[PDB]
């Protein structure tokens, strides 16, 4: 008799696992500087 037919093709392999999460974005820049403080108090009265 003749040789048999080849068997079926093998099962496919599964997808690889999902990749790792990307690294967190970096912290943002500082805000702008605060406003200047209040003017100081007047000095004490002087003589003349």
């Amino acid at each position: 008799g003749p040789k048999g037919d080849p068997g079926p093709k093998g099962d496919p392999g599964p997808p690889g696992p999902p990749g790792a999460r990307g690294q967190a974005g970096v912290l943002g820049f500082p805000g702008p500087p605060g406003p200047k403080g209040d003017k100081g108090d007047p000095g004490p009265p002087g003589g003349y």
């Binding site: 008799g1 080849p6 093709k9 912290l27 500082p30 805000g31 003017k39 100081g40 002087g46």
Partner: protein, 48 residues
């Protein structure tokens, strides 16, 4: 008549595809406040 020999083992299965790319990272934290503002101007001299 005599039975023929068995057929060949089948061809190998398809390779699996790469996993999905991971999700991109989160947006970074907001930045801290800006620096404290500069000290106020000195007061005026006292009056007379």
């Amino acid at each position: 008549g005599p039975k023929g020999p068995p057929g060949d083992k089948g061809p190998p299965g398809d390779p699996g595809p790469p996993g999905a790319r991971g999700e991109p990272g989160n947006i970074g934290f907001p930045g801290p406040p800006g620096p404290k503002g500069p000290k106020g101007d000195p007061g005026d001299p006292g009056g007379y």
